[PDB]
Design a protein around this ligand. Sequence first.
Ligand SMILES: COC(=O)Nc1ccc(Cc2ccncc2)cc1
Length: 119
Amino acid sequence: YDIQAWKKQCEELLNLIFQCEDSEPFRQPVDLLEYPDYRDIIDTPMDFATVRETLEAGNYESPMELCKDVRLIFSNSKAYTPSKRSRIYSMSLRLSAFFEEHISSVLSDYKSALRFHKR
Ligand SMILES: COC(=O)Nc1ccc(Cc2ccncc2)cc1
């Protein structure tokens, strides 16, 4: 029932994502010089360094907020892909499955801890 445990659990999950070769296109903001029309399609850019920085700044209140930003990285990749068979999109699908598999217990434990706090 540790209400604060999610933060280090998220730091460790982010460390695992950074070690994954599938995260390489998503470690830094999309290069607008290489994809000049990117902001015509994508309203809110997001990447794993921004997520890590937001967490380290103490600007996430809950793992649900972190999860919303990580999910935005994947929906941006799906929205920008010209094909469902593109390399970067295919990497986002595997990385998304890995993320969802690992974030599930973080979300469950935090919500359980908060319910216990308000029992
Ligand atoms: C400096 O790193 C980048 O610019 N990385 C990157 C990440 C996503 C995209 C967008 C995309 C393209 C094709 N399929 C799916 C999504 C482009 C580039």
